[PDB]
Curated annotation (Swiss-Prot):
EC number: 3.2.1.17
Name of protein: Lysozyme C
GO cellular component: a single term: extracellular space
Signal among keywords: yes
Primary localisation category: secreted
UniProt subunit comment: Monomer.
Gene3D superfamilies xref list: 1.10.530.10
Organism: Gallus gallus (Chicken)
GO BP terms in the entry: cell wall macromolecule catabolic process; defense response to bacterium; defense response to Gram-negative bacterium; defense response to Gram-positive bacterium; killing of cells of another organism
Domain of life of the native organism: Eukaryota
UniProt-listed InterPro entries: Glyco_hydro_22 (IPR001916), Glyco_hydro_22_CS (IPR019799), Glyco_hydro_22_lys (IPR000974), Lysozyme-like_dom_sf (IPR023346)
Active site residues according to the UniProt entry: 35, 52
Expression tissues: In the egg white and polymorphonuclear leukocytes.
Amino acid sequence: KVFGRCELAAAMKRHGLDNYRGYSLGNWVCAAKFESNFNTQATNRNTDGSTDYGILQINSRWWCNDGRTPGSRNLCNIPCSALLSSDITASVNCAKKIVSDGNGMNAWVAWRNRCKGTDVQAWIRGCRL
């Protein structure tokens, strides 16, 4: 599923990401835009053999099991394929664990490089929340 901008904002708000660990909703929408172009089916292979999955491009090196990342962890206790669903619950629940682990949203390279320090409120302008 390819989300619309306001559609995804509303789904993320319903799942409790607005101001989660101090990150306003626009941060999460911005990160999803540049990680996956709002596409739940996005996958991207990393040079170390791990793979990033879903709308927030969550990495199999630490966070999910895809059966082909030897020596990796599964800290969200899910198959990585669950992160490609049209229902974003699994991705949001896992993202809450990631952002709590100490480095905040710096865990997402695209957020650090393209959202951090910008006017992220612009990503939820016009949306009915």
